[PDB]
């Protein structure tokens, strides 16, 4: 009846579902096939069908209505929306429309949308009055995203030294720092854990670029939120899609004082998409990366911002550094001093077996004395103080011992004053 | 009436505006565009728009007023100027320019000064005799730069220090040297209220560059 | 059946010749048209005549005219065609009153050298050009007009000083596109205006 539940559905309940139906030779086909052959045979019965998707809106004029399940990538059940559509509803890029749509006529290929009755989960004569995201007043971050999680186990205490080392909040646009098998793919998963548990209201994004399958799997059967990604074997072309869809739907959210985070990863990995895919300008930089091919990236890393009128848009990303590309380090040059929080991770203290890597010294957060009350805020202060003479390989051994024997962080800085 | 007030007031004031005079569809759209269509759609009605920018001379040969509130941004509400209009008033580039303006006539774009009747907050035939910047003879600071504010909390001792470290004059070309994280955003935040505040008649400008939004 | 449909949609007088009458008529049935038309003239009335085809009347006229002995290429005497251009170069707009429009279709790429020479002749002759793409045809989209081809002289005297200009901005968007899909263009942009007018306003907001 619907094409959200679909999707959701396994392949196995589709077949299934589509024999009873009198269809036949479903298993040999593509998911997104059986889709279009369900709904077409559904579509012929009578009975009404519903659709969602995310607007797409090309330069030809027309608009389709990808679907978060196939990280928006295009695929015959896509709903098609006409430029009248976008007329008499005003329409941007991102946008969420769910509603009724029409069995494909000969001659057409796509579904069309009938009416719409939801845009941005809101009334559509209320979005058209919503305030673009380019005029909302950026600001500092002031409400801090809490990190350390009551239920996780000492094992792991790479979210408590998250908290100690740099505090995030919301619109914060901090930047991670971290060569190749650093631990820079799990360290996201404790803060994807932190944030949906401890705010649970908060619209959790995670973005891949040029991950591998098997990453893919994992990060969505964990992260409690809607997860998108491009693998490796997908054309450059793919990726910068990818990424330009997660933003224009970000900043459509905000508008509605909504906050959304999104797990960038990684920043450096997606630099390489714009630069192929943008034509040579005929100034070439250092590494073969032209300058503006690394606008692109700036812009959609910049957009993080706290917006004065009402919601957040927290943009978190992954530097790749020492990877043995010169392309790759000059990219980090454009992106060092453009994030407000910085946590850099130590490639020696990772063969230490020591985990989490995180240079102390060097990692922390500008503007820390809006997120943190006055007493948590000076009692990091004469932390960094004792942790500063000591070298970079031992303070995070320091920290890890220390952590181990206290239940939280509180209790972590009542020992520090005992000494 | 003026491009002046219109930029200062808020976006919400201007969708306000905009839909009380018939336009639609204007809260997706960009602030620029926002100002562009009110003034067309006020252009039409018959009442005269003024307008005021920063004179842009390009290599062309005309130029554009550009407007402050947008930090000097090329933009559809920019006031396009004719060289005919540098030529009968002789003016530079940073010229401030104040004064009439018409309706786009189809074909055009941008809008088009009427007339000038406000030059470097002067009278324009005053300002065509103002002496070149680089003929004027350069000398020493002579008066000095007060940085101690009465009002200013013992709290911050910045301003105090600066007075007893290294004291500014009018003219002063000081340059500043620090390492990152050493405080030095807040540093000219400071300064920027001493100067506003003991020296209120003073012009202040602050110009950031490659600087988070 | 072509003729039948004409003279029940056209709300005036159809007249035509079909294939199977001679030479001799098909010059007969255009002599009578011009020379009517031009009586109606000469009472201060105007007249549109819509040829069809100019082509296929200089094939007639070739044929009932005796050779003079000088043969062009494709089998066309030189005074075999002195009397279509007459014929169509009879319409013009009289200053006393009246005017006389006269619209025709050219046949090209019909795979007959004969026909192709006879376009040659008319290339410059007319004031308005109207050039359909095959190619356009072909992929199922209507009407299938070479913009960038098609054009009128001097139209400043026809429209309006606004609506003149809109279409220069109009066509300084279209030219850089290829005809194939200019036309693609045109069609989805019309589609969602209701009147020219409104299509005119649009294309000055982007
Ligand atoms: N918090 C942690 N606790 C235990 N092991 C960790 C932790 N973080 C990283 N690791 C180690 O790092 C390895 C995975 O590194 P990975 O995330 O793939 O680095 P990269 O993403 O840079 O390739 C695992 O084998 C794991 O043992
Ligand atoms: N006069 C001051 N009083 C108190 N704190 C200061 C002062 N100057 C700088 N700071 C500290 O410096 C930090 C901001 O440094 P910042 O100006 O961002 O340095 P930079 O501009 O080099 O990055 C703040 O957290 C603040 O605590
Ligand atoms: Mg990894
Ligand atoms: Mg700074």
Redesign the pocket.
Same mark, same amino acid.
């Given at each position: 009846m619907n094409l959200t539940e679909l999707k959701n559905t396994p392949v196995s309940e589709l077949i299934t579902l589509g024999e009873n139906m009198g269809l036949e030779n479903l298993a040999r086909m593509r998911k997104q096939d059986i889709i279009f052959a369900i709904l077409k045979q559904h579509a012929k019965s009578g009975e009404d069908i519903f659709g969602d998707g995310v607007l797409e809106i090309l330069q030809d004029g027309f608009g389709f209505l990808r679907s978060a399940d196939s990280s928006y990538l295009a695929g015959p059940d896509d709903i098609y929306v006409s430029p009248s559509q976008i007329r008499r509803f005003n329409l941007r890029t991102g946008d969420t429309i769910s509603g009724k749509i029409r069995p494909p006529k000969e001659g057409e290929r796509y579904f069309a949308l009938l009416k719409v009755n939801e845009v941005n989960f809101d009334k559509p004569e209320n979005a058209r009055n919503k305030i673009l995201f380019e005029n909302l007043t950026p600001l500092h971050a002031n409400s801090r995203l809490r990190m350390e999680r009551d239920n996780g186990s000492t094992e792991?205490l790479?979210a408590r030294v998250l908290d100690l080392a740099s505090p995030i909040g919301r619109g914060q646009r901090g930047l991670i720092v971290?060569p #190749? +098998?650093?631990? +820079?793919?799990?360290?996201l998963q404790?803060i994807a854990q932190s944030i949906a548990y401890n705010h649970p209201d908060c619209v959790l994004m995670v973005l891949l670029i040029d991950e591998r399958p098997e990453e893919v799997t994992e990060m969505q059967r964990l992260v409690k939120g809607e997860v998108v990604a491009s693998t490796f074997d997908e054309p450059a072309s793919r990726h910068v899609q990818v990424a330009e869809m997660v933003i224009e739907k970000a900043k459509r959210l905000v508008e509605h004082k909504k906050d959304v985070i999104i797990l960038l990863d990684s920043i450096t990995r997606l630099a390489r998409a714009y630069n192929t895919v943008v034509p040579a300008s005929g100034k070439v930089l250092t590494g073969g990366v032209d300058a503006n091919a690394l606008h692109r990236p700036k812009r959609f890393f910049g957009a993080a911002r706290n917006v004065e009128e009402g919601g957040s848009l927290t943009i978190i990303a992954t530097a790749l550094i020492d990877t043995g590309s010169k392309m790759d380090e000059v990219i980090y040059e454009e992106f060092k001093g453009t994030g407000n929080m910085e946590l850099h991770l130590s490639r020696k203290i990772?063969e230490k077996r020591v985990? #989490?890597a995180i240079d102390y010294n060097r990692s922390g957060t500008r503007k820390e004395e809006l997120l943190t009350t006055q007493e948590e805020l000076q009692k990091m202060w004469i932390l960094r103080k004792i942790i500063h003479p000591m070298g970079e390989i031992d303070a995070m051994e320091f920290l890890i011992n220390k952590l181990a024997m206290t239940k939280t962080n509180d209790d972590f800085f009542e020992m520090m004053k005992r000494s």
């Open positions: 792991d790479t971290a #190749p +098998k650093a631990g +820079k793919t799990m360290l404790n990772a985990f #989490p």
